[PDB]
């Protein structure tokens, strides 16, 4: 705890102005609150006539709904003058700055003899209340008026918390004396006296308004309204005791209004509940109370990171909900009770109110699960988050936040249309339950959203958005027609976090049948009714469950919640969303059966693939050679679980269809001493290995390939071998003499080869030593990470959308996806394909260089990297990249537990390339924080994105590839794919390269061949980005900053020459894209120069 | 192993009466026997922990570490017949139910007809 | 103008292969007077040049040589020195050091590891003899540039003990003493007077350093030599242009005379 | 402008034509030239020409030099292009870098020829054969194109001919086991020195080289008491502090 008290007082230094822009606006409400004191009083009146005497101005009143009927009308109604409190957070002095402001609290207490010993019902206070804040505006307006500073200030109507129970003041500014420049409002409220009564008629637990139901917001609201001052007390009493508390709630409000934690409400359909002024006093009643012998949880003598993990640890393990709760009083231990109340509680016996009840059950499970990962996250010692635990804003990007979400576009109307709109309840026994439409309308959304999906979700929140608290003063309400109702949203969004683990399980089995029909049965057929059965499974017990025919441009969580609404909330409550059927299916559609019918979870033709590899490898084993394998294993693509497509058999043309198998022999020393012998004995090791299999497995084949990329030595060969099931196979053989004869090659070669030969190691130990280790990681992990798959195929095709894969390789890619799953420390571990490529996106446009080495630990949830290791790696980072100044070719730097050294994926591309990847993410991340998430905004994102440099030359193989790289074009005949997709290898084995494309490797080659003087980029997955027929392909590319004006020439300027002035040449671009159509005659077919 | 199983890994070893021998005897040195430990130790260790325990099951089937023991031990002494004879697990990681269905093949229970 | 690190980052990552500006922006944090600094760029140039570009490398060693010599000590010339010559080619680095050493106008240790050159790599390259000959010859050392003869006769074979006496004799017609360069040069001449192009510099050496009577005898003498059909012409094409720019109808008449008998 | 015909530091103009393009109309691919030598046998009367085309083998030579002899009729027989490495696959050698079997410029070709009457025959047809390509671009000397670039590297993706690389590592072998096995001989039997010395080899060693290397590569117990003087200091350091 060293460098994090140092980051506290930074973070403290971020916003220390507390003292210059906080008097002019205390003198404005110094002025404020001197009006306040002269404001002239009235007397007694009656409805009847305060109705014309309102009606006659311009001004109107608001009211709890609804407006009194005059046949109610017994109470007194008063206008007194108000003792008046400037209490609460900037009397404490715990100042942020915001963009919206903060509030100074100021209340209007009521008078002792406006009110009575009945004041708990009917509501008549709360139109006392709001007739009481109607003519002390339109006095205050008046007032200003002859005052004469109009033109600066303007007061408007707002719920106070989103709550139409209390409307409140919302002064505010606009464009010598006009205030622009700090917090842009505060709140005038009006509350009632402290001594009122006793809890029998304040709890949630009692009711007299008529039909004994809760009257939970009722009694909150006018109990936190009359009973407040205990509160501020005990504020100051624990301000004398200990002096951490404003650095605490400040600490407390960065970190909740990053998690975007208003004090709204949840009950009204809105992200929060939860307030920092509860934070406030939650810390508190812990300061003194919490344990279970009523401990003094935490000491008020240590500072304000202990007492703030202290409260982010008891609200993270400590239940306050569903088992136990915490009872205090301010004015004598406070103990914790382990009954629950059912409700995110804590109980008062000074005040007796629940000062939770702001919030939802929804929202306390994922404040208590958040409070629990930054437990985790602020627990961990061989790494510190200080930057990814308060300075991030991950309510900016909502779905950022949540895993999936979907719209509910309803047009129910009216609040008398109610019965044939809505098919829920209607009457004063829900409307005391409750408060209004929308309150038990997202309250039942969360019932029927928590019963129909059940443990497939992780958590669940709803928002109403289009709502609009800003309602003004000559309105009653927002009175609003918000497309189709005159309620106050415009759509109704609900957001799911889910179990990725049984997120798309095709059945969900309830209760057990028996012959008495228990409740839960009756329960259950009554929510599902004409899609639930009882069905035997195959062990023998009887459910009621209910079927769901998956699909794979959707989850089956879409069509579940779809009917589990249009069966319960309304008939014609339409569901909107289009993201997830956008991008879930721009993963190509592998040509399988009914693989449009299956998920996307689904790896079966992986698992098909291993399978034909297990009956290769029995066959490999089981012959007899003069040095025996030691041990086979695959180490490629479809094996990692990473193929962009899912490999179908006979796909000849993807370029990710031979996967390398590696092989490893016996420890022989009679290996030959230098590198191209020791390679023409593996050629002959492989050579011996395909005669004995044509010899006896004739249902095999088998045929050689030259490599290249390991370089230096052209007689590297593998065999290939094509499997009767439909696959092949590349096979490496690796041997023990291989480092160190490369190791042997550094040490005597010569003193200026050595970071070209250590380049070659590198791609060596990329290819063979090291990426074994990578696979048996990441394929280990990718059971604990379910998503990770169909993420990382994601990313390499919105990669080769924009042309990176030719440079690029896979295991940067992988990594960089592996990130925010292993890191989820703004976040959660993504459980959808929207919000897991999205993560990727944002942190690779968070992504810096110099000071972002990206370090992974390879781990399930709840080994890691240690201490020591860690700062090796940061050792490592530090010392590489400062010798280094800004990487001119070492780019990106990703470590792992496989690798400490970092550079071993990431050297060779091109700072091009690489700032082309980090500004297209941050194109991307600015463009969906701006435009919005929309279809067409998800497809303008997935444009190939060309923006024109220098050329581009379009070519054409003379086949449209999809057939033979075995995926459907979303066609609707299956049969004319079915019997088009050459479900047999050729008798003549010289064809493949007329069926498969050589673009890559021609891009390659050229790549290498003009390496200095223009880059290349193209696309390589034909199938997938080519077209629907999928026959398209570019090579497009950037010319060095160096050739861009004419250059001298010498003997050594490496480029094609354009000599037309006798000493300063030019690269002749007709000579060059002419050359480039000389090699692609039969490839080429059109070029585009600017 | 890579994965947060631990193994106590045995292996049992045995002198080879050398051929072309004379004495009845072939007894290692004492200080034979703590080279052929230490050496037998660190490569078994490198066999496991360059492992997953799948891996490592497909790897001890066809008897392999065996035979490496006695490639990379034969410089030392001769060395008759090498078996590894118990492997005790003593923690398992977790469950991973999907692991598991992986180390199988897939598998999705679905429906029967109810017909009542 | 670059006046800026950063913008002088900026052109080395526009170009890095440029040892001009990389030399210049070392130069640069010589003008704010940082040698250990400059040090770490130099090394950071060495580890970020495309290492086939020899001659830009031969300009940074004139960067570490020129750091090493101006600013630096000693011990860590001779240890930037010593992985000079681990890393590149290491007679020229040396006959440059020799000249960056000239132009430093040090010559007391100078001498002794132009002495140390000579037994490490002297006897087979000629660049060395060179700069020694015409250090010693302008810095009045006669007598020792006449006997470092006896040590270039000792190392030098026959295959190049004409070239390495030519050019004695070239420096000590130049900035040292004709009947000396003289002396050298009719041993070979009483070798070989068959030898045409040494005979050319020969007289033209004679005509720069401006002796009459005697570029007269060796021009008269020259055809009483051997002269086939290119040589007479050729030396003829010298003489007359030299005469030009009486005794021109003279070898007029001879020039005539030779065509026929 | 065409009309240049010679650049500043002694390099010869000789530009090429084009093949039809699907979407071009050109007949421009320039090169330089150069003549000069060096001491070896492989680098006599060369010739540097920078900026080749992309795979203008041997067989290109051929043809070019072909339609020279039919323009000028010179004298003109080409063998081979030493540092054909405009790839960037053969800078470095692994095998004489790690071995003992063959022991030991940017982007050009420096092609060889038979005779100096002849490398300078086409020089000077060289030369004139700039002017003419400065003058008029249609009257001009032409390699045409037969495209081994098209035989042999499109294709890659091919399966390799089973014949060929088992008659290719049978000879491999065939050699190498022979080398290696007389240079294992001969630094297991090598016992003189000129000097009368013998040289300590160890076992089954193969090679005089390898034993050079490694020792190229591979490049005290004084008691603080029970002497006399030694401890007249210890004394003394006790006595001053």
């Given at each position: 705890s060293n460098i994090f008290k140092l980051q506290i007082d930074e973070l403290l230094e971020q916003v220390k102005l507390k003292q210059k822009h906080v008097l002019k606006v205390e003198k404005f409400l110094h002025k404020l609150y001197d009006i306040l004191q002269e404001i002239p009083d009235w007397e007694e009146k009656s409805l009847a006539e305060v109705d014309s005497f309102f009606k006659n101005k311009i001004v109107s009143v608001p009211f709890v709904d609804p407006k009194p009927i005059p046949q109610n009308t017994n109470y007194k109604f008063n206008y007194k003058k108000p003792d008046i409190s400037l209490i609460g957070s900037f009397a404490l002095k715990a100042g942020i700055y915001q963009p919206n402001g903060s509030s100074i609290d100021t209340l209007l207490t009521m008078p002792k003899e406006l009110f009575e010993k009945k004041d708990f019902l009917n509501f008549r206070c709360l139109h006392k209340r709001s007739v009481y804040l109607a003519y002390l505006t339109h006095h205050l307006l008046i007032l200003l008026k002859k005052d004469k500073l109009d033109s600066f200030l303007q007061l408007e109507y707002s719920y106070f918390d989103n709550d139409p129970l209390l409307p409140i003041l919302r002064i505010s500014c606009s464009k010598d004396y006009n205030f622009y420049k700090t917090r842009f409002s505060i709140n005038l409220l009006i509350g009632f006296p402290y001594?009122?009564?006793?809890?029998?008629?304040?709890?949630?637990?009692?009711?007299?308004?008529?039909?004994?139901?809760?009257?939970?917001?009722?009694?909150?609201?006018?109990?936190?309204?009359?009973?407040?001052?205990?509160?501020?007390?005990?504020?100051?009493?624990?301000?004398?005791?200990?002096?951490?508390?404003?650095?605490?709630?400040?600490?407390?409000?960065?970190?909740?209004?990053?998690?975007?934690?208003?004090?709204?409400?949840?009950?009204?359909?809105?992200?929060?509940?939860?307030?920092?002024?509860?934070?406030?006093?939650?810390?508190?009643?812990?300061?003194?109370?919490?344990?279970?012998?009523?401990?003094?949880?935490?000491?008020?003598?240590?500072?304000?990171?202990?007492?703030?993990?202290?409260?982010?640890?008891?609200?993270?393990?400590?239940?306050?909900?569903?088992?136990?709760?915490?009872?205090?009083?301010?004015?004598?231990?406070?103990?914790?009770?382990?009954?629950?109340?059912?409700?995110?509680?804590?109980?008062?016996?000074?005040?007796?109110?629940?000062?939770?009840?702001?919030?939802?059950?929804?929202?306390?499970?994922?404040?208590?699960?958040?409070?629990?990962?930054?437990?985790?996250?602020?627990?961990?010692?061989?790494?510190?988050?200080?930057?990814?635990?308060?300075?991030?804003?991950?309510?900016?990007?909502?779905?950022?936040?949540?895993?999936?979400?979907?719209?509910?576009?309803?047009?129910?109307?009216?609040?008398?249309?109610?019965?044939?709109?809505?098919?829920?309840?209607?009457?004063?026994?829900?409307?005391?339950?409750?408060?209004?439409?929308?309150?038990?309308?997202?309250?039942?959304?969360?019932?029927?959203?928590?019963?129909?999906?059940?443990?497939?979700?992780?958590?669940?929140?709803?928002?109403?958005?289009?709502?609009?608290?800003?309602?003004?003063?000559?309105?009653?309400?927002?009175?609003?027609?918000?497309?189709?109702?005159?309620?106050?949203?415009?759509?109704?969004?609900?957001?799911?976090?889910?179990?990725?683990?049984?997120?798309?399980?095709?059945?969900?089995?309830?209760?057990?049948?028996?012959?008495?029909?228990?409740?839960?049965?009756?329960?259950?057929?009554?929510?599902?009714?004409?899609?639930?059965?009882?069905?035997?499974?195959?062990?023998?017990?009887?459910?009621?469950?209910?079927?769901?025919?998956?699909?794979?441009?959707?989850?089956?969580?879409?069509s579940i919640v779809n009917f589990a609404l249009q069966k319960h909330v309304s008939k014609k409550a339409q569901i909107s969303n289009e993201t997830i059927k956008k991008f879930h299916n721009f993963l190509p559609l592998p040509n399988l059966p009914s693989s449009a019918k299956t998920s996307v979870l689904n790896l079966s033709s992986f698992f098909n693939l291993k399978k034909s590899f297990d009956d290769l490898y029995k066959i490999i084993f089981q012959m007899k050679l003069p040095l025996s394998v030691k041990s086979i294993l695959p180490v490629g693509s479809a094996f990692r679980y990473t193929s962009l497509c899912q490999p179908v058999p006979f796909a000849?043309?993807?370029?990710?269809?031979?996967?390398?198998?590696?092989?490893?022999?016996?420890?022989?020393?009679?290996?030959?001493?230098?590198?191209?012998?020791?390679?023409?004995?593996?050629?002959?090791?492989?050579?011996?290995?395909?005669?004995?299999?044509?010899?006896?497995?004739?249902?095999?084949?088998?045929?050689?390939?030259?490599?290249?990329?390991?370089?230096?030595?052209?007689?590297?060969?593998?065999?290939?071998?094509?499997?009767?099931?439909?696959?092949?196979?590349?096979?490496?053989?690796?041997?023990?003499?291989?480092?160190?004869?490369?190791?042997?090659?550094?040490?005597?070669?010569?003193?200026?080869?050595?970071?070209?030969?250590?380049?070659?190691?590198?791609?060596?130990?990329?290819?063979?030593?090291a990426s074994v280790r990578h696979t048996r990681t990441l394929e280990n992990i990718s059971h604990s990470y379910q998503f990770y798959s169909p993420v990382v195929r994601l990313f390499k095709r919105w990669l080769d959308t924009h042309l990176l894969l030719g440079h690029i390789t896979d295991e940067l890619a992988e990594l960089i996806a592996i990130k925010p799953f292993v890191d989820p420390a703004p976040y959660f571990i993504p459980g959808s394909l929207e919000n897991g490529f999205l993560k990727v996106l944002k942190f690779i446009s968070?992504?810096?260089?110099?000071?972002?080495?990206?370090?992974?630990?390879?781990?399930?949830?709840?080994?890691?990297?240690?201490?020591?290791?860690?700062?090796?790696?940061?050792?490592?980072?530090?010392?590489?990249?400062?010798?280094?100044?800004?990487?001119?070719?070492?780019?990106?730097?990703?470590?792992?537990?496989?690798?400490?050294?970092?550079?071993?994926?990431?050297?060779?591309?091109?700072?091009?390339?690489?700032?082309?990847?980090?500004?297209?993410?941050?194109?991307?991340?600015?463009?969906?924080?701006?435009?919005?998430?929309?279809?067409?905004?998800?497809?303008?994102?997935?444009?190939?994105?060309?923006?024109?440099?220098?050329?581009?030359?379009?070519?054409?193989?003379?086949?449209?590839?999809?057939?033979?790289?075995?995926?459907?074009?979303?066609?609707?005949?299956?049969?004319?794919?079915?019997?088009?997709?050459?479900?047999?290898?050729?008798?003549?084995?010289?064809?493949?390269?007329?069926?498969?494309?050589?673009?890559?490797?021609?891009?390659?080659?050229?790549?290498?061949?003009?390496?200095?003087?223009?880059?290349?980029?193209?696309?390589?997955?034909?199938?997938?980005?080519?077209?629907?027929?999928?026959?398209?392909?570019?090579?497009?590319?950037?010319?060095?900053?160096?050739?861009?004006?004419?250059?001298?020439?010498?003997?050594?300027?490496?480029?094609?020459?354009?000599?037309?002035?006798?000493?300063?040449?030019?690269?002749?671009?007709?000579?060059?894209?002419?050359?480039?159509?000389?090699?692609?005659?039969?490839?080429?077919?059109?070029?585009?120069?600017? | 192993?890579?994965?947060?199983?631990?193994?106590?890994?045995?292996?049992?070893?045995?002198?080879?009466?050398?051929?072309?021998?004379?004495?009845?005897?072939?007894?290692?040195?004492?200080?034979?026997?703590?080279?052929?430990?230490?050496?037998?130790?660190?490569?078994?260790?490198?066999?496991?922990?360059?492992?997953?325990?799948?891996?490592?099951?497909?790897?001890?089937?066809?008897?392999?570490?065996?035979?490496?023991?006695?490639?990379?031990?034969?410089?030392i002494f001769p060395l008759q017949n090498i078996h590894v004879r118990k492997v005790k697990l003593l923690k398992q990681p977790k469950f991973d139910v999907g692991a598991l269905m992986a180390l199988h093949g897939e598998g999705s229970g679905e429906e029967k007809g109810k017909k009542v | 103008a670059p006046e800026s690190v950063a913008d002088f980052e900026r052109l080395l990552i526009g170009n890095p292969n440029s040892s001009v500006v990389w030399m210049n922006y070392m130069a640069f944090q010589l003008q704010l007077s940082e040698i250990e600094k400059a040090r770490e760029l130099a090394e950071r140039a060495l580890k970020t040049i495309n290492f086939r570009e020899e001659a830009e490398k031969l300009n940074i060693w004139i960067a570490m040589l020129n750091l090493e010599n101006t600013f630096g000590t000693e011990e860590t010339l001779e240890e930037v020195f010593s992985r000079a010559c681990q890393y590149m080619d290491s007679y020229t680095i040396h006959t440059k050091l020799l000249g960056i050493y000239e132009i430093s106008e040090k010559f007391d240790k100078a001498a002794e590891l132009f002495k140390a050159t000579a037994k490490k790599f002297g006897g087979e390259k000629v660049s060395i003899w060179v700069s020694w000959g015409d250090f010693l010859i302008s810095h009045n050392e006669e007598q020792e540039a006449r006997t470092i003869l006896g040590n270039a006769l000792k190392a030098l074979p026959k295959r190049n003990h004409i070239e390495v006496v030519r050019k004695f004799a070239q420096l000590e017609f130049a900035k040292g003493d004709p009947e000396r360069g003289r002396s050298l040069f009719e041993g070979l001449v009483a070798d070989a007077p068959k030898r045409i192009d040494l005979w050319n510099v020969y007289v033209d050496q004679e005509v720069k350093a401006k002796d009459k009577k005697k570029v007269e005898d060796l021009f008269e003498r020259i055809i009483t030599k051997k002269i086939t059909r290119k040589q007479a012409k050729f030396f003829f094409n010298k003489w007359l242009q030299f005469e030009e720019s009486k005794t021109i109808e003279y070898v007029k008449a001879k020039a005539t005379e030779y065509v026929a008998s | 402008i065409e009309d240049i015909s010679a650049m500043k530091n002694g390099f010869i103009v000789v530009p090429f034509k084009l093949p039809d393009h699907k979407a071009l109309p050109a007949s421009l691919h320039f090169m330089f030239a150069k003549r000069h030598q060096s001491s070896n046998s492989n680098e006599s009367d060369c010739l540097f020409l920078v900026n080749l085309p992309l795979l203008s083998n041997i067989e290109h030579m051929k043809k070019f030099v072909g339609q020279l002899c039919g323009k000028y009729d010179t004298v003109s027989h080409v063998e081979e292009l030493l540092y054909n490495d405009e790839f960037g696959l053969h800078e470095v050698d692994l095998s004489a870098l790690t071995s003992d079997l063959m022991s030991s410029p940017r982007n050009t070709a420096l092609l060889k020829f038979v005779d100096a009457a002849s490398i300078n025959n086409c020089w000077n047809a060289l030369k004139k054969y700039s002017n003419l390509h400065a003058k008029h671009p249609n009257e001009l000397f032409e390699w045409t194109y037969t495209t081994p670039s098209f035989t042999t590297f499109v294709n890659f993706y091919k399966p390799l001919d089973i014949d060929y690389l088992k008659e290719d590592i049978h000879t491999h072998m065939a050699i190498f086991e022979q080398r290696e096995a007389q240079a294992q001989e001969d630094v297991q039997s090598s016992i003189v020195d000129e000097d009368g010395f013998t040289l300590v080899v160890g076992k089954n060693t193969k090679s005089l080289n390898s034993i050079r290397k490694k020792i190229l590569n591979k490049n005290k117990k004084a008691k603080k008491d029970f002497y006399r003087f030694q401890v007249r200091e210890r004394k003394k350091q006790e006595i001053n502090q």
């Open positions: 001594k009122v009564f006793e809890p029998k008629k304040l709890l949630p637990n009692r009711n007299c308004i008529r039909i004994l139901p809760a009257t939970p917001l009722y009694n909150f609201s006018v109990l936190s309204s009359s009973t407040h001052e205990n509160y501020l007390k005990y504020l100051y009493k624990t301000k004398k005791q200990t002096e951490s508390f404003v650095e605490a709630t400040v600490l407390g409000r960065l970190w909740l209004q990053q998690r975007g934690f208003s004090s709204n409400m949840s009950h009204s359909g809105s992200l929060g509940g939860f307030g920092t002024f509860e934070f406030t006093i939650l810390m508190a009643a812990l300061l003194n109370g919490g344990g279970i012998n009523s401990n003094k949880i935490l000491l008020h003598g240590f500072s304000s990171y202990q007492l703030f993990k202290g409260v982010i640890k008891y609200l993270a393990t400590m239940d306050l909900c569903h088992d136990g709760h915490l009872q205090f009083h301010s004015n004598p231990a406070s103990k914790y009770i382990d009954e629950g109340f059912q409700t995110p509680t804590l109980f008062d016996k000074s005040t007796k109110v629940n000062i939770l009840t702001k919030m939802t059950v929804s929202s306390y499970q994922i404040l208590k699960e958040y409070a629990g990962e930054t437990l985790r996250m602020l627990n961990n010692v061989v790494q510190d988050q200080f930057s990814n635990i308060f300075l991030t804003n991950i309510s900016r990007f909502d779905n950022l936040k949540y895993d999936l979400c979907y719209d509910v576009q309803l047009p129910l109307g009216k609040y008398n249309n109610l019965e044939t709109s809505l098919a829920a309840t209607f009457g004063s026994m829900e409307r005391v339950k409750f408060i209004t439409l929308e309150n038990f309308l997202a309250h039942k959304i969360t019932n029927v959203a928590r019963y129909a999906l059940g443990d497939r979700i992780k958590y669940i929140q709803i928002e109403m958005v289009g709502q609009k608290s800003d309602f003004p003063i000559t309105k009653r309400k927002v009175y609003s027609n918000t497309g189709g109702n005159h309620f106050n949203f415009d759509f109704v969004r609900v957001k799911l976090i889910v179990n990725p683990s049984e997120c798309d399980k095709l059945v969900t089995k309830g209760p057990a049948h028996s012959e008495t029909m228990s409740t839960e049965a009756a329960v259950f057929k009554n929510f599902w009714g004409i899609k639930s059965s009882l069905r035997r499974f195959k062990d023998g017990s009887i459910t009621h469950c209910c079927v769901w025919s998956t699909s794979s441009s959707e989850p089956i969580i879409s000849y043309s993807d370029p990710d269809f031979f996967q390398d198998v590696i092989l490893e022999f016996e420890t022989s020393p009679k290996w030959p001493d230098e590198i191209t012998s020791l390679e023409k004995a593996k050629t002959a090791f492989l050579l011996k290995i395909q005669e004995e299999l044509s010899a006896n497995s004739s249902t095999y084949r088998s045929f050689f390939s030259r490599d290249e990329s390991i370089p230096y030595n052209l007689e590297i060969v593998t065999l290939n071998i094509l499997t009767p099931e439909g696959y092949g196979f590349k096979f490496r053989v690796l041997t023990e003499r291989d480092e160190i004869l490369y190791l042997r090659a550094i040490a005597n070669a010569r003193n200026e080869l050595k970071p070209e030969l250590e380049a070659t190691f590198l791609k060596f130990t990329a290819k063979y030593l968070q992504w810096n260089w110099k000071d972002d080495p990206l370090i992974l630990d390879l781990v399930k949830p709840e080994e890691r990297l240690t201490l020591a290791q860690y700062k090796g790696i940061q050792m490592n980072f530090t010392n590489l990249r400062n010798s280094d100044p800004n990487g001119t070719h070492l780019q990106f730097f990703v470590a792992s537990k496989n690798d400490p050294s970092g550079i071993l994926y990431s050297s060779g591309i091109p700072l091009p390339i690489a700032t082309r990847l980090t500004a297209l993410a941050k194109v991307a991340v600015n463009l969906l924080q701006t435009h919005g998430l929309n279809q067409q905004t998800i497809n303008l994102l997935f444009t190939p994105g060309l923006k024109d440099y220098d050329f581009v030359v379009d070519l054409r193989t003379p086949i449209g590839l999809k057939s033979s790289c075995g995926i459907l074009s979303a066609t609707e005949f299956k049969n004319i794919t079915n019997d088009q997709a050459p479900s047999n290898f050729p008798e003549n084995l010289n064809d493949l390269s007329e069926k498969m494309d050589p673009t890559y490797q021609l891009v390659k080659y050229l790549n290498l061949k003009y390496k200095n003087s223009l880059i290349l980029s193209s696309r390589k997955y034909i199938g997938v980005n080519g077209g629907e027929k999928g026959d398209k392909n570019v090579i497009t590319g950037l010319i060095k900053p160096l050739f861009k004006g004419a250059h001298k020439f010498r003997v050594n300027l490496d480029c094609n020459v354009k000599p037309v002035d006798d000493e300063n040449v030019i690269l002749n671009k007709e000579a060059i894209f002419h050359e480039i159509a000389a090699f692609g005659n039969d490839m080429v077919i059109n070029f585009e120069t600017d | 192993t890579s994965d947060d199983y631990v193994l106590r890994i045995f292996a049992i070893a045995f002198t080879r009466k050398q051929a072309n021998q004379v004495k009845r005897h072939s007894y290692a040195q004492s200080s034979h026997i703590r080279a052929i430990r230490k050496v037998i130790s660190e490569i078994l260790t490198k066999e496991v922990q360059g492992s997953t325990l799948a891996q490592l099951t497909s790897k001890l089937i066809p008897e392999v570490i065996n035979k490496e023991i006695e490639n990379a031990t034969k410089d | - | -």
